[PDB]
Write an enzyme that holds these catalytic residues in place. Structure first.
Site, PDB file in Angstrom:
ATOM      1  N   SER A 245     -11.955 -20.343  -5.906  1.00  0.00           N
ATOM      2  CA  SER A 245     -11.120 -20.050  -4.990  1.00  0.00           C
ATOM      3  C   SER A 245     -11.305 -20.827  -3.393  1.00  0.00           C
ATOM      4  O   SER A 245      -9.961 -21.471  -3.151  1.00  0.00           O
ATOM      5  CB  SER A 245     -10.385 -18.935  -5.188  1.00  0.00           C
ATOM      6  OG  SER A 245     -10.005 -17.991  -6.529  1.00  0.00           O
TER       7      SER A 245
ATOM      8  N   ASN B 115      -7.297 -19.836 -10.928  1.00  0.00           N
ATOM      9  CA  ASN B 115      -8.318 -19.195 -10.503  1.00  0.00           C
ATOM     10  C   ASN B 115      -7.986 -18.265  -9.996  1.00  0.00           C
ATOM     11  O   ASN B 115      -9.341 -17.458 -10.096  1.00  0.00           O
ATOM     12  CB  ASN B 115      -9.312 -20.062  -9.222  1.00  0.00           C
ATOM     13  CG  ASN B 115     -11.283 -19.929  -9.881  1.00  0.00           C
ATOM     14  OD1 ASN B 115     -11.269 -19.931  -8.609  1.00  0.00           O
ATOM     15  ND2 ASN B 115     -10.906 -20.298 -10.935  1.00  0.00           N
TER      16      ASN B 115
ATOM     17  N   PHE C 262      -7.796  -6.325   3.224  1.00  0.00           N
ATOM     18  CA  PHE C 262      -7.912  -5.519   3.736  1.00  0.00           C
ATOM     19  C   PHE C 262      -7.732  -4.228   2.613  1.00  0.00           C
ATOM     20  O   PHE C 262      -9.137  -3.867   2.217  1.00  0.00           O
ATOM     21  CB  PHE C 262      -6.603  -5.201   3.745  1.00  0.00           C
ATOM     22  CG  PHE C 262      -6.178  -4.315   4.103  1.00  0.00           C
ATOM     23  CD1 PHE C 262      -5.301  -3.117   3.276  1.00  0.00           C
ATOM     24  CD2 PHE C 262      -5.657  -3.111   5.664  1.00  0.00           C
ATOM     25  CE1 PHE C 262      -5.406  -1.636   3.627  1.00  0.00           C
ATOM     26  CE2 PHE C 262      -5.130  -1.971   5.976  1.00  0.00           C
ATOM     27  CZ  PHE C 262      -4.757  -1.091   4.942  1.00  0.00           C
TER      28      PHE C 262
ATOM     29  N   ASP D 255      -6.902   6.329  -4.904  1.00  0.00           N
ATOM     30  CA  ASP D 255      -6.080   5.312  -4.855  1.00  0.00           C
ATOM     31  C   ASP D 255      -6.192   4.735  -6.215  1.00  0.00           C
ATOM     32  O   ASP D 255      -6.689   5.861  -7.214  1.00  0.00           O
ATOM     33  CB  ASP D 255      -6.543   4.122  -3.880  1.00  0.00           C
ATOM     34  CG  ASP D 255      -8.215   3.709  -4.484  1.00  0.00           C
ATOM     35  OD1 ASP D 255      -8.351   2.727  -3.242  1.00  0.00           O
ATOM     36  OD2 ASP D 255      -8.393   4.216  -5.424  1.00  0.00           O
TER      37      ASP D 255
ATOM     38  N   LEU E 130      -8.846   3.741   2.558  1.00  0.00           N
ATOM     39  CA  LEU E 130      -9.598   4.509   1.919  1.00  0.00           C
ATOM     40  C   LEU E 130     -10.280   5.178   3.313  1.00  0.00           C
ATOM     41  O   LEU E 130     -11.496   5.197   3.556  1.00  0.00           O
ATOM     42  CB  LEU E 130     -10.293   3.740   1.308  1.00  0.00           C
ATOM     43  CG  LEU E 130     -11.622   4.195   0.423  1.00  0.00           C
ATOM     44  CD1 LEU E 130     -12.885   4.384   0.985  1.00  0.00           C
ATOM     45  CD2 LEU E 130     -11.414   4.739  -0.553  1.00  0.00           C
TER      46      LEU E 130
ATOM     47  N   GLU F 291       1.029  -1.468   0.413  1.00  0.00           N
ATOM     48  CA  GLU F 291      -0.153   0.078  -0.120  1.00  0.00           C
ATOM     49  C   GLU F 291       0.601   1.526   0.098  1.00  0.00           C
ATOM     50  O   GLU F 291       0.237   2.038  -0.351  1.00  0.00           O
ATOM     51  CB  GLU F 291      -0.384   0.072   1.543  1.00  0.00           C
ATOM     52  CG  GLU F 291      -1.668  -0.966   1.105  1.00  0.00           C
ATOM     53  CD  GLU F 291      -2.915  -0.959   0.229  1.00  0.00           C
ATOM     54  OE1 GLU F 291      -3.496  -1.767  -0.342  1.00  0.00           O
ATOM     55  OE2 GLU F 291      -3.199   0.366  -0.466  1.00  0.00           O
TER      56      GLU F 291
END
Ligand SMILES: [Cl-]
Ligand SMILES: [Cl-]
Length: 164
Positions: free
Chosen positions: A117, A132, A104, A20, A32, A11
């Site tokens: 998945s 996948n 996250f 972002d 965010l 990040e």
């Protein structure tokens, strides 16, 4: 290596409001603020999150506090999630970090929709789960990050983050 170090690498850290990868107002370590196109809305959310008039900028300590809160929330969120909990519980330590990373980034809701998945990881079919996971918007939009997380699920090691 640990979850904080891992997400810190994925990040980055910015002390000023920024947009972002999806164009949303964010600050700190991928925190965010709002999906709203208004910078004032973002400034408002920031002040409310920090508890002071920041005017769009925070300190490293403030960023780290948001980060601590966010990681805690993602974990707790996974634990409360019917679809996620069992996967998380079935995984080893390193792999649990990869799952937290995704939650996250996309939220519990988004991750919970990777049904196929998820079942593959539960069954410990690493290579299959990795293929996948890659058939996703997530992979196509942020390939470098997605590749690091997928390699982690695939190998159960930190190699993808070694040397960054
Ligand atoms: Cl696809
Ligand atoms: Cl990326």
């Amino acid at each position: 290596m640990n979850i904080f170090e891992m997400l810190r690498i994925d990040e980055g850290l910015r002390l000023k409001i920024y947009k972002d990868t999806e164009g949303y107002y964010t600050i700190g370590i991928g925190h965010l603020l709002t999906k709203s196109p208004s910078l004032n809305a973002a400034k408002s959310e920031l002040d409310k999150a920090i508890g002071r008039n920041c005017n769009g900028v925070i300190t490293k300590d403030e960023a780290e506090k948001l980060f601590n809160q966010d990681v805690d929330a993602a974990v707790r969120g996974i634990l409360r999630n019917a679809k996620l909990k069992p996967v998380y519980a079935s995984l080893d330590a390193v792999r649990r970090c990869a799952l937290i990373n995704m939650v996250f980034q996309m939220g519990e809701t988004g991750v919970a929709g990777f049904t196929n998945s998820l079942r593959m990881l539960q069954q410990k079919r690493w290579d299959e789960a990795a293929v996948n996971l890659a058939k996703s918007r997530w992979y196509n939009q942020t390939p470098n990050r997605a590749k690091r997380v997928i390699t982690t699920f695939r190998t159960g090691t930190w190699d993808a983050y070694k040397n960054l």
